[PDB]
Amino acid sequence: PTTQLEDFKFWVQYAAATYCPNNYVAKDGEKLNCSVGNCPDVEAAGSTVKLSFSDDTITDTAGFVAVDNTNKAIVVAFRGSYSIRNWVTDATFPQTDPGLCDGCKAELGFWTAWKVVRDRIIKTLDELKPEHSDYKIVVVGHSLGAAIASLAAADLRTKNYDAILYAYAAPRVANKPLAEFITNQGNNYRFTHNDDPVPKLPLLTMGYVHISPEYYITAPDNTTVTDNQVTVLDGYVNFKGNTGTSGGLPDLLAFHSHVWYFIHADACK
Amino acid sequence: IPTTQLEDFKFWVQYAAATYCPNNYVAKDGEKLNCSVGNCPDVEAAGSTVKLSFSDDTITDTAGFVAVDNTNKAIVVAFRGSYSIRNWVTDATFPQTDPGLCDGCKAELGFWTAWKVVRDRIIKTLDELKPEHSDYKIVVVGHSLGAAIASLAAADLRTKNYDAILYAYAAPRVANKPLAEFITNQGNNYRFTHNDDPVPKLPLLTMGYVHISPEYYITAPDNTTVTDNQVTVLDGYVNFKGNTGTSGGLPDLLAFHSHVWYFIHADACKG
Secondary structure, X not given: OOOHHHHHHHHHHHHHHOOOHHHHOXXXXXXXXXOOOOOHHHHHHOOEEEEEEEOOOOOOOEEEEEEEOOOOEEEEEEEOOOOHHHHHOOOOOOEEXXXXXXXXXXXXXXXXXXXXXXXXXXXXXXXXXXHHOOOEEEEEEEOHHHHHHHHHHHHHHHOOOOEEEEEEOOOOOEOHHHHHHHHXXXXXXXXXXXXXXXXXXXOHHHOOEOOOOEEEEOOOOOOOOOHHHEEEEOOOOOOOOHHHHHHHOOEHHHHHHHHEEOEEOOOOO | OOOOHHHHHHXXXXXXXXXXXXXXXXXXXXXXXXXXXXOOXXXXXXXXXXXXXXXXXXXXXXXXXXXXXXXXXXXXXXXXXXXXXXXXXXXXXXXXEOOOOOOOOOEEHHHHHHHHHHHHHHHHHHHHHOOXXXXXXXXXXXXXHHHHHHHHHHHHHHHOXXXXXXXXXXXXXXXXXXXXXXXXXXXXXXXXEEOOXXXXXXXXHHHOOEOOOOEEEEOOOOOOOXXXXXXXXXXXXXXXXXXXXXXXXXXXXXXXXXXXXXXXXXXXXXX
């Protein structure tokens, strides 16, 4: 027995692991571990880092490529910037051309963050193929890291890496053509939680929409998510679910909802 | 030289700005206040000097200084609160505590705790400065969460006979209704809001908090010179015609840009 919900509860632990300072400086061969105890199934699987990355310089991006020999997965996991105020204070989100498809545009900050690490990650994936050949490729993040993961998965797929995307609490990354492009790639699991303000940014009026579908989590904070607390909603814009909460506004006081996606996602700091 | 109230308001915010500069809140006695990013030029022109600095990196994430301004004949007590807004709101709970200031009065626990950690040092310093500065104003100032700490510090200091003048730029609520009425009627309160800034809408009215009155509601665009026509004085403990009524009454995360522009770029010195 393996259910979609159990799957969702697992991969978020790799997103959680990207917040741990020891994991995104880890040497090749080092076991992933989360000192606060929020990635127990990752530790149980014995997953090790292949390559870690930490950007001090530009994007404040961190993460790793890890190998899970238990579940036969290569995991590409991203942490974005922790400062939400720094992300929104300019109140501007310019787009850029990622070179993926006709008329497609992506959020400049997130696309840049991916570009900075893309070549290391592709090189690492190539090195791993021979002894891991039948492994699935999982691309995962939470919060701003989930935005980077969304674009990373989109790009990796055009390069023939069959990437399965788990984007927990993701901001919008794409204009309408790019959202349609990514949606049509399939293997997209994008999550929202109650009134979390972050998936409502950047705004619809800024020319962004979402990858479809939305996996809308209605469980309370710090509770296990059950099967009737996840609702699947189709469309690049859907006002049932997270986008319709708080009258459509990104409520600052709803931020508590951002950190609970099946688990306390950022608890490792 | 003749000066206006608006010019006064544009000056004290530069002390708030100075609390974001790490050099100022670790400074030893005798170091000149200065802001590397250049947003406190009139403080530097006044030659203002640190008497005591304080920084708590352990529990409250509070920092600031007591400085002497001999040009303007003021002793300035300035606070920086926690810079992480997400950490401040993530619990979504804002418990009240009894500050011992007045009957039925209650204050926000976090901000009251922050003041209590530095209160003894600050009073010691005010007392040391008094004999050679005896006729100086005592100005208590902050921006953002620091403005909340300043609000409660001023309230407390006044009950101790220090005639504190409060400049609270972009302050969160700190008080329940009895405490807000008490602080308001002490007078010498200048609390500012700017357009749709979300921070002055927290904690919620429904959590038992109200604001000190009046509100100086700034409606100028970001990064522009504010004129008298762009500052509106609104009294009352809850007033829906200023900042509290913006964004349909909700704290809009995307309105955060409004929080950092209070006459100047208030937090620019955080690097």
